[PDB]
Amino acid sequence: MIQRTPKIQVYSRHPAENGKSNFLNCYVSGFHPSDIEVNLLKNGERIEKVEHSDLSFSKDWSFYLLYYTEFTPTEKDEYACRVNHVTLSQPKIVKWDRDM
């Protein structure tokens, strides 16, 4: 049996401009087993948009998930990715930083 902790990156498709339609991406990589929960949060609430996701696999017991939704950045809204996985003792929340 093998288990690997997901690496989590949160980033927009295009440079963020308040307040212009864009896409917010989570790339959750290198994890095992495949059981996982991934959501984008807006001010702590699951994003009120259609989710897109794409799962792939490496032969070295590794899964890769690209997850995204539409979003319109603003100054006051904070976004985050929330991941839960058996390797995590609590859900992991990774903030979006448009300057990161």
* Residues paired with 87 in a beta bridge: none
Cα–Cα separations (whole angstroms), residue 100 to 43, 46, 59, 83, 95: 18, 22, 31, 19, 10
**β pairing state of 79-84 and 92-95:** antiparallel
Tokens of 47: 């994003």
Q: Which of 47, 50, 21, 33 is nearest to 88 (CA)?
A: 33
Rounded alpha-carbon distances, angstroms, from residue 15 to 12, 90, 97: 7, 31, 11
Rounded CA separation 59/86 (Å) = 20
**82 neighbors 90 (Cβ within 8 angstroms):** no
* Backbone phi, psi, residue 68, to 5°: -155, 160
The Cα–Cα gap between 50 and 53 comes to: 10
The method of structure determination was X-ray
CATH no. of 1-100: 2.60.40.10
